[PDB]
C-alpha cells in the first residue's frame, strides 16, 4: 500500500478576495489574469485601495491537495506559513480537508503569505502576492518518508520565485524517483514561465519532472511561440505526459504521439476563475493515481475545474466525489 | 448638516463560516439558530472539528453600519478589536466600505473576537462566539463628537454580555439625547433577551432607547409569551417605534397605535441567513434618516435583508443602492 496518492508542494498562501471594476486594474498597474509579485510596501498600498474582502485559504498546490482529498484520494502538502493568525487559518483549512500537513512554522516573521485577488466582471482573476514566510521553505521541510510514500509528488513552477524552495524540489525528485514514484509540475503562470523557461525545460528534459500541467498561455510562453500546435508538439517531446488546459475549450492530454481531447463541462456562469487549473490538476491526478485512462483523468480534471469556477474561493465547498458519482465518472 | 446618519456600536467580530450537517449541531451541543458564547478552550475545540472555512468581517452592528454605507448613507462604528491580523482584517473591511471607524486597539491580548458560524442545509446559522478583545470596549471608546453628530446611534443587545460596554452605551444615550438625536437598539438574540430582559425593558421605558428592532422570537422572549399579538401590543407600549421582523413573512413597524406591515422578497433559496436582521436594520435606518415613511423604511429593510440571505457572508457584496433604485425605493 502507499500512504499517499498525491503529495503537493507550493507557496502557502491565504487569499484576500474582492471584485473590482476594469479600470481598477489599469489605475493600479495590475497585470490582468496574472500572478503579480509584490513587496510589503506595495501590499499595504493595494490593500488600502481594496474594497471589503473575503478570506480563503489558497496557494496553487494547496488547492490541488485539497481537491484530491475532496475527491476521495489521499493527499499530503509541503508549504511554509508563519506562527500567526493567517498561518493558523491556512493550517486549519488544509488539515480539516484531511490533507496531511506537518510543515513547521519558523516564527511569526516574515508573516504568512497572502494574495490580494481582484475578480473582474468577466470572472478573470488578477493576483497580487506577498510571499512572506514562503521565502523560508527549504530542504529542511522535506518529509522524506512522505515523498518516499506518495504515488505522485506535484509542485508549482511558482516555487522558483522564493530562494531555496527549488532545493527542496530537487530533493523530492531524487527521493520520488529512487522509490519508483512519479514527479509532476504545473507551469503556474505565463510570466513565471517567462522568468524560468530554461530551468523548467531542464526539469522536463533531465527527467526530474514526468507529468507537466500547462494552460494555453503557459504552453505558448514555454516555447515563445504564437503557434499552439507547435507548443503541443514540443511539450509532448519534452515530458512523458502533458496535460494542457484550454479554458472553455476543455483540455488535451498528450503522451508520446497519443492525444486525448476532453470537453469543458456546462457551467452556469464564470463567477471566479481562481483555482481552475489547480482543480483540473486535482481531478487529473486523482484519476491517474486510481489507474484511470488518460481521457478519464482529463474528464475528472474538467469536472473539478468547472465546479471551482462557479464559486467565490479557490477550493470547492461542495463534494467533488458526489459530483464525480453523479457525472458517472465515479 | 449632520456628519453622520447612523452610528452603530457593537462587538467587533470576524466570522469563520462553514456548512455542516444537522447532526453536527447535536453532537457538539450547539444551540441551533442562536448566538452561543464560548471561551478560548471551547473555541479551539470547535475549530478543530470544523471543516474548511471562509472568513468575513462580521459583528451585528458592524454589518448594519456597512449596510447603511452601501445604501449611500453616512455611517460610523464603535467596536474594539486587537492589534492582530484578524483585527487588521476587521479594520480594513469596515473602513473600505466608507464607514468611519476609529476605535483604537488596546493590545494583542485578548485577541480579536471571532465567531464560528455553522450554516445548515436550511440556511439557518448557528454562531459560536469567543468575545476576545470585545471585553475591553468601554466609555473610553465613545467618540463624543461622533455621537453628538449622528442622527441615530444604534447598538446591540449583545453588548450586555461584555462587562463595560453598557457604560459606553449609557454615555451615548446621554450625548445623543442632549443633541436632539435618537437612540436605537436591537434585541439581538432570544437567549440574549432571556439574559437581560429586565434591563432591556428599562432602556425602553426610561426612554434611553427610542427605536427597537426585534425578530419574532426576541419579541416573544421579551414578554415571555407565546402570543405574538400580545408581544406586538406590549412592544408598541414600551418604545416610541418598534420594527419587528418575521423572516419570510416580512416585517411590521409599530408606532403608538400605527401598524405598517411590509412583505418579504420572494426567495428562490436561503443560502445563509447570517446578517438578515442586521441588514433589515441597515435599510430601515437608512430610510429613516432620509425622512422616508415608516412603510418605506420597512420596504428598504426587507430589500437589504433579502439580498444578504442569498449569499455566503453577512455583508452584501453587491450594491444595495443599485438594488434600491431598481426597486423604485431609490
Ligand atoms: N469558461 C469555462 N467554462 C467551462 N470550463 C472552464 C472554463 N474556464 C476554465 N474551465 C475549466 O478549467 C480548466 C482549466 O482552465 P484554464 O483557464 O485553462 O486554467 P488556468 O487556471 O490554469 O488558467 C479547463 O480545462 C476547464 O476544464
Ligand atoms: N426566508 C426568507 N425569505 C425572504 N426574506 C427573508 C427570509 N428570511 C428573512 N428574510 C428577511 O430578513 C428580515 C429579517 O429576518 P429575520 O429572520 O426575522 O431576522 P433575524 O436575522 O433578526 O433572525 C425579514 O424581515 C425579511 O425581510
Ligand atoms: N506566487 C504564488 N505561488 C503559489 N500560489 C499562488 C501565488 N500567488 C497566488 N497563488 C494562488 O493561486 C491560486 C489560484 O491558482 C490562489 O488560490 C492563490 O492563493
Ligand atoms: N456576541 C455577538 N455580538 C455581536 N455580534 C455577534 C455576536 N456573535 C455573533 N455575532 C455576529 O452576528 C452576525 C449575524 O447577525 C455575524 O456576522 C456575527 O459576527
Ligand atoms: K473560484
Ligand atoms: K448571508
UniProtKB/TrEMBL annotation, chains A, B:
Residue span, Carbohydrate kinase PfkB domain: 57-316
Pfam families: PfkB
Superkingdom classification of source: Bacteria
Entry annotated with the keyword Transferase: yes
Amino-acid positions noted as binding ADP in the UniProt annotation, renumbered to this chain: 215, 245, 247, 250, 277, 302
Keyword Nucleotide-binding: yes
Assigned protein family: Belongs to the carbohydrate kinase PfkB family.
Protein name: Probable sugar kinase protein
Amino acid at each position: 500500500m502507499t500512504r499517499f496518492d498525491v503529495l503537493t508542494v507550493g507557496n502557502a498562501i491565504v487569499d484576500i478576495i474582492s471584485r473590482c471594476n476594469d479600470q481598477f486594474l489599469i489605475d493600479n498597474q495590475i497585470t490582468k489574469a496574472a500572478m503579480n509579485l509584490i513587496d510589503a510596501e506595495r501590499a499595504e498600498l493595494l490593500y488600502s485601495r481594496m474594497g471589503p474582502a473575503l478570506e480563503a485559504s489558497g496557494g496553487s498546490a494547496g488547492n490541488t491537495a485539497a481537491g484530491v482529498a475532496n475527491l476521495g484520494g489521499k493527499a499530503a502538502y509541503f508549504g511554509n506559513v508563519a506562527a500567526d493568525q493567517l498561518g493558523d487559518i491556512f493550517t486549519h483549512d488544509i488539515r480539516a480537508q484531511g490533507v496531511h500537513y506537518q510543515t513547521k512554522p519558523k516564527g511569526a516573521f516574515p508573516p504568512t503569505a497572502r494574495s490580494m485577488i481582484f475578480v473582474t466582471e468577466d470572472g478573470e482573476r488578477s493576483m497580487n502576492t506577498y510571499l512572506g514566510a514562503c521565502v523560508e521553505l527549504g530542504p529542511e521541510d522535506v518529509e522524506a518518508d512522505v515523498v518516499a510514500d506518495a504515488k505522485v509528488t506535484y509542485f508549482e513552477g511558482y516555487l522558483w520565485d522564493p530562494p531555496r524552495a527549488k532545493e527542496a524540489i530537487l530533493d523530492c525528485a531524487r527521493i520520488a524517483h529512487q522509490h519508483g514514484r512519479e514527479m509532476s509540475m504545473t507551469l503556474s503562470d505565463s510570466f513565471c514561465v517567462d522568468r524560468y523557461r530554461g530551468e523548467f525545460l531542464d526539469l522536463m528534459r533531465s527527467g526530474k519532472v514526468d507529468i507537466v500541467f500547462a494552460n494555453r498561455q503557459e504552453a505558448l510562453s514555454l516555447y515563445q511561440t504564437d503557434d499552439f500546435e507547435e507548443a503541443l508538439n514540443r511539450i509532448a517531446a519534452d515530458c512523458k505526459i502533458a496535460a494542457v488546459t484550454m479554458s472553455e475549450n476543455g483540455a488535451v492530454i498528450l503522451k508520446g504521439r497519443e492525444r486525448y481531447y476532453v470537453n469543458a463541462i456546462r457551467i452556469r456562469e464564470v463567477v471566479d476563475t481562481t483555482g481552475a487549473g489547480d482543480l483540473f490538476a486535482s481531478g487529473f491526478l486523482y484519476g491517474y493515481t486510481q489507474g484511470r485512462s488518460l481521457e478519464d483523468c482529463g474528464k475528472l480534471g474538467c469536472l473539478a475545474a468547472g465546479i471551482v469556477i462557479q464559486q467565490i474561493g479557490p477550493r470547492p465547498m461542495t463534494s467533488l466525489s458526489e459530483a464525480a458519482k453523479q457525472a458517472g465518472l465515479i
